[PDB]
Symmetry: C2
Subunit: 47 residues, 2 copies
């Protein structure tokens, strides 16, 4: 059971943007809207 990113439709929402205060996907951080934001892992990252 996963949430998928609205923009990156094949990516799982697995991180949290601490700057915007919104869960996001890895590609949103690598290339996308949160590229310069501080992020945290969601538990799924280290399970």
């Amino acid at each position: 059971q996963h949430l998928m990113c609205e923009e990156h439709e094949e990516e799982k929402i697995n991180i949290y943007c601490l700057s915007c205060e919104v869960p996001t996907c890895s590609l949103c951080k690598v290339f996308g809207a949160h590229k310069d934001c501080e992020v945290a892992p969601l538990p799924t990252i280290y399970k």
Copy 2:
């Protein structure tokens, strides 16, 4: 900037289901699919 629940379309995704490993909304925990799950707050809850 917020993610909204797919089922509870007026609710913000502001909690994390630790049991299912998926971000969710409060109503999913109070009444919905994650009612018997263990949950955690997302940072937005205590900002």
